[PDB]
Design a protein around this ligand. Structure first.
Ligand code: UDP
Ligand code: UDP
Ligand SMILES: O=C(O)[C@H]1O[C@@H](O[C@@H]2[C@@H](O)[C@H](O)O[C@H](CO)[C@@H]2O)[C@H](O)[C@@H](O)[C@@H]1O
Ligand SMILES: O=C(O)[C@H]1O[C@@H](O[C@@H]2[C@@H](O)[C@H](O)O[C@H](CO)[C@@H]2O)[C@H](O)[C@@H](O)[C@@H]1O
Ligand code: MN
Ligand code: MN
Lengths: 265, 262
């Protein structure tokens, strides 16, 4: 339970993709337990099939959910006995090498969101914010780019945030349910307000693959027409609810010294 | 004005090279002052020529030294008014782009040495240490490499560490003088013992170059490296323990060069 993390993977109409990723994550070092947040209402969980294929390196708890909400994976699960939580979308495969190193980074910055997918917010109209990535001009000062968020769907964060999240303003919970989007944007707001530091630190993945297309079922949430537009919306809504833009920019990109070999020179 | 830093450059029989680098560093953003530790005992400082070619962006102070000692640059200079000190050998050209970034990193970790040249110690026979770089097997766990030191000769570190150095066991001073080497290793020992964290944080230089040749160099001397190992062991003895701590963190600027995150 000490020096270990808990994998929280929410899955929706991607059971085939899920079983494949589960075979991967179960074998990662420092993994204490896995919590599958089953969002397939009225659909028989896979646990049975999962046991017939045992033994497994660690315990895997399949929690059926009331409704299919993006927030479900943010509840305070009693079976989480680790200080750190590893949250991954059920369509992403992060190499063990990336997890071990990133987790070791999280331990040096437990109060921050350590992940592999960085994003930013920009502003052009005094007070009006927009959501985006490196395709948008750097809001930042001089050189390079900046990021003010790390998406929780590929990250390590202190499990006490799930608690802190629950204690957040009702309007925020409402906002997440109303859109079934921007739950990670909320978490980033929540974290930075709590620490006063950038909500996250970006760890460049040496081997992370997205399996979106390799699945029977839905194409994926970010392909919806109003996805991005919906995200810019959320940032502005949160600024209203919290009455202020808390996100702070950062341009720190951490890579593993010497992995690959001689990448320092 | 913790929004600026002071450059401390020690020069020796490299005036041509010094005058060149000076033209570069004087223009670096957030540079408050430059302190040239003139280690040429007997020769006249470039001050006159320097001013004949002014005006310059910042005050440059040439401080003639009594003797030619490596540790001269680790003295507490009254003219240093910044919390940060940028220390560069007089044969190394670090781009402004790198300085500006590295400085911004130091501000987020003022108690650590933020620099572009990482090195480490290793141990094969319990207790005996050896000095080296990436040519030596990783001491740590099992992936990639590890560094336990960041050479001060191209780094950013808190100015309060120069005063803290003066208060080190006499033996430490003797050692530095004795070998005319190891000052940077002594500093790493000092900082790690003080903060309890890794002595430094490595920032990958995007554009740093060595002009050593264009001017012959200390590390070329036959007993240079062997001496450095020696120093780690002597220091370990003077401190009754090996404080240096391994780190595998490599910091690069997000988006510099463009899309280096993908
Ligand atoms: O209606 C939905 C859509 C998605 N998800 C899950 O929420 C995460 C993110 O969804 P997706 O990969 O589609 O996000 P995207 O990458 O497309 O924004 C994944 O763990 C999904 O299994 C969910 O629980 N309900
Ligand atoms: O006897 C000496 C040798 C060197 N230096 C200076 O100390 C630093 C490091 O020396 P060098 O570049 O020769 O070190 P190397 O890269 O060869 O180990 C530089 O600022 C030199 O100007 C000095 O002051 N006295
Ligand atoms: O809301 C997101 O930012 C969203 O981004 C998805 O990523 C893709 C990226 O893989 C592709 O290269 O470019 C797209 C547009 O620029 C987009 O950034 C990510 O997969 C998804 O999980 C995120 O929610
Ligand atoms: O003692 C040092 O570590 C010493 O290293 C010098 O750097 C050279 C490097 O430029 C060359 O490529 O490889 C050498 C090892 O074979 C060595 O690392 C550096 O210039 C000097 O300042 C350092 O004190
Ligand atoms: Mn996805
Ligand atoms: Mn040199």
């Amino acid at each position: 339970a000490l020096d270990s993390f808990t994998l929280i993977m929410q899955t929706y109409n991607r059971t085939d993709l899920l079983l494949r990723l589960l075979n991967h994550y179960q074998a990662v070092p420092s993994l204490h337990k896995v919590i599958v947040v089953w969002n397939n209402v009225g659909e028989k969980g896979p646990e049975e099939l999962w046991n017939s294929l045992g033994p497994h390196p660690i315990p895997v708890i399949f929690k059926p959910q009331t409704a299919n909400k993006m927030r479900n994976r943010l509840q305070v699960f009693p079976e989480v006995e680790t200080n750190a939580v590893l949250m991954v979308d059920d369509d992403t495969l992060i190499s063990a090498q990336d997890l071990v190193f990133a987790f070791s980074i999280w331990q040096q910055f437990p109060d921050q969101i350590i992940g592999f997918v960085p994003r930013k917010h920009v502003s052009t109209s005094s007070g009006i914010y927009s959501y985006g990535g490196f395709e948008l001009q750097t809001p930042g000062p001089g050189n390079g780019d900046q990021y003010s968020m790390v998406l929780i769907g590929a990250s390590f964060f202190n499990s006490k945030y799930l608690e802190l999240f629950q204690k957040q303003p009702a309007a925020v919970h409402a906002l997440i349910d109303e859109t079934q989007n921007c739950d990670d944007i909320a978490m980033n707001f929540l974290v930075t307000r709590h620490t006063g530091k950038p909500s996250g630190i970006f760890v460049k993945p040496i081997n992370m693959v997205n399996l979106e297309k390799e699945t029977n079922g839905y194409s994926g949430m970010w392909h919806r027409a109003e996805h991005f537009l919906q995200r810019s919306y959320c940032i502005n809504k949160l600024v209203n609810i919290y009455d202020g833009m808390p996100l702070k920019y950062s341009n720190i990109m951490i890579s593993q010294f010497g992995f690959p070999y001689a990448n320092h020179k």
